[PDB]
Design a binder for this molecule. Structure first.
Ligand SMILES: [Zn+2]
Ligand SMILES: [Zn+2]
Ligand SMILES: [Zn+2]
Ligand SMILES: [Zn+2]
Ligand SMILES: [Zn+2]
Lengths: 214, 217
C-alpha cells in the first residue's frame, strides 16, 4: 500500500530558527496530505490539511507545502512550545496511512551530568533483595554510557536502564540505572561503583561507596 | 467545545474479547465521520476503521488486516462510538484513539480523544514495592519495583513538590516493571522538613507513601 516515509526520526534546532520536516509518499497522492503534532503523554493535534491549509487555531508559523510525492512542514521561528512529534498522513487511497514521525530536539551547550549513587534500603534488604541505583541528571548531549563495577570488576547482568525525554525547562536529559542483586550476593563484596562516560569529561565521572564504611 | 473520551482499556488475556467506548460532546454526533486509530509502542499510528455520517447511510470502511476481527458502530440514542475487538493477541497492545473525521471520503482526523491503553498479556497483576533512595543541593528518590501492569503515577509531597522532579519511564523484565523517580531539594530544607514520595498503582488498588529519612552510613 501507500507508505509515508519521514526520513528523519530526530531533527536538531534552536529557538528562533526555521525547521523543515520532510515526508515522502510511495506514489502520487496529489495534495491529500495532513500534518499532526503530538506532545509526550498527549493526543495528536491537527495542524495542516489539504497539504497547505492550516487548521483553525493553528498559529501562522506552521506552513505546509508540496504536491505529488514530496511534502514539507515548515515551522518558522521555533518556540519552546513546539518540542513535540510531527507526522504526516495521506488520504488519497485506502487504507489511510501515517508517517513514523519526526521529533524536534532542542540545541544547547554541553553540560556534565550530576551523578548520585544510592545503597539498598532497609525495606528491600529485609525482603532479601539488594538494588543499587545511580541517577544521572541534567546532561547534554544525550549520548552517554554507564558501567557498573563491583570490587573493581565490571558487571552487566541484572542492570536496568531508563532515559527521560528532553527536559522542557533546561533542554537536558536524565538517566537512571538500577543494579539488582540478591542480599546474599550483595554482602559478598565491598565497593560498588557507577561510572559515567560523557563527552564533557575526558575521564569518566565516578561515584562509589564501600560496604565496610557502613 | 469538541470533546472525546475513550474507555474500556486495561489488561486482558490473549484470545479474549472486549468493547471500547468513546463518549463525544460539543458537536452534532450524527453529522460527522467517526474513526478508530491505534498507536502501538514505538510504532507508527495505524488506522483501523471509520463509519460515515447519517446522510451517507452510516456505512463503514475497514483496514483489511482487521476485517472480521474489529467492528465499529454508533449508539442508537446516544453520542457514543464503539469498537468491538475479538481474538486478542499481544500485538494488539496499544493506545486506542477515538477521532472525529473531516473531508468526506478524503478522511483526515481533525479532533482526537485522550485515548485508552490496552495491554494483552498472560502475566498476573502484581502490586509494587516502594523503596526509598537516601544518601547545598541534595538528591533523593524512590524505587518502584516488581509491579504489573502499567501505569504507575508518582508524586512528591502529595503534589506540592514538583520542581526538580525526574520520573523515569518503566522498564519491563520477566513480566514485571521497574520505575524510579528522583527529586533535588536544597540541603536547608531536608531533613529539616519531610520529603515523601507517593506511588499509585490503580490496577491493584495500591497507594503507598514512603518518607525519605537520612542514613547513618
Ligand atoms: Zn538525537
Ligand atoms: Zn482525494
Ligand atoms: Zn559475588
Ligand atoms: Zn476542524
Ligand atoms: Zn529537570
Amino acid at each position: 500500500d501507500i507508505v509515508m516515509t519521514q526520513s528523519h526520526k530526530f531533527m536538531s534546532t534552536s529557538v528562533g530558527d526555521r525547521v523543515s520536516i520532510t515526508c515522502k509518499a510511495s506514489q502520487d497522492v496529489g495534495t491529500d496530505v495532513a500534518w499532526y503534532q503530538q506532545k509526550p503523554g498527549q493526543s495528536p493535534k491537527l495542524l495542516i490539511y489539504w497539504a497547505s491549509i492550516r487548521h483553525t487555531g493553528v498559529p501562522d508559523r506552521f506552513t505546509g507545502s508540496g504536491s505529488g510525492t514530496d511534502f514539507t512542514l515548515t515551522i518558522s521561528n521555533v518556540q519552546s512550545e513546539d518540542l513535540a512529534d510531527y507526522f504526516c498522513q495521506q488520504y488519497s487511497s485506502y487504507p489511510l496511512t501515517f508517517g513514523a514521525g519526526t521529533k524536534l530536539e532542542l540545541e544547547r551547550a554541553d553540560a556534565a551530568p550530576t551523578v548520585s549513587i544510592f545503597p539498598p534500603s532497609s525495606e528491600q534488604l529485609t525482603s532479601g533483595g539488594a538494588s543499587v541505583v545511580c541517577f544521572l541528571n541534567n546532561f547534554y548531549p544525550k549520548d552517554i554510557n554507564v558501567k557498573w563495577k563491583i570490587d573493581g570488576s565490571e558487571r552487566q547482568n541484572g542492570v536496568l536502564n531508563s532515559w527521560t525525554d528532553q527536559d522542557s525547562k533546561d533542554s537536558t536529559y536524565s538517566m537512571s540505572s538500577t543494579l539488582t542483586l540478591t542480599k546474599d550476593e550483595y554482602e559478598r563484596h565491598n565497593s560498588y561503583t557507577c561510572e559515567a562516560t560523557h563527552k564533557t569529561s575526558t575521564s569518566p565521572i565516578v561515584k562509589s561507596f564501600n560496604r565496610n564504611e557502613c | 467545545e469538541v470533546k472525546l473520551v475513550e474507555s474500556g482499556g486495561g489488561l486482558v488475556q490473549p484470545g479474549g474479547s472486549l468493547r471500547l467506548s468513546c463518549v463525544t460532546s460539543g458537536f452534532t454526533f450524527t453529522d460527522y465521520y467517526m474513526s478508530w486509530v491505534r498507536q502501538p509502542p514505538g510504532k507508527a499510528l495505524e488506522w483501523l476503521a471509520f463509519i460515515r455520517n447519517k446522510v451517507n447511510g452510516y456505512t463503514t470502511e475497514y483496514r483489511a488486516s482487521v476485517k472480521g476481527r474489529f467492528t465499529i458502530s454508533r449508539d442508537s440514542s446516544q453520542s457514543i462510538l464503539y469498537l468491538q475487538v475479538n481474538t486478542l493477541r499481544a500485538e494488539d497492545s496499544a493506545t486506542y484513539y477515538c477521532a472525529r473525521d473531516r473531508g468526506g471520503n478524503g478522511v483526515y482526523f481533525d479532533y482526537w480523544g485522550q485515548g485508552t491503553t490496552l495491554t494483552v498479556s498472560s502475566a498476573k497483576t502484581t502490586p509494587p514495592s516502594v523503596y526509598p533512595l537516601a544518601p547545598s543541593m541534595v538528591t533523593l528518590g524512590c524505587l518502584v519495583k516488581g509491579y504489573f501492569p502499567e501505569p504507575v503515577t508518582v508524586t512528591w509531597n502529595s503534589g506540592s513538590l514538583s520542581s526538580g522532579v525526574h520520573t523515569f519511564p518503566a522498564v519491563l523484565q520477566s513480566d514485571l516493571y521497574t520505575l524510579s523517580s528522583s527529586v533535588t531539594v536544597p540541603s536547608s530544607t531536608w531533613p529539616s522538613e519531610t520529603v515523601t514520595c507517593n506511588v499509585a498503582h490503580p490496577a491493584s488498588s495500591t497507594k503507598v507513601d514512603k518518607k525519605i529519612v537520612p542514613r547513618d552510613c
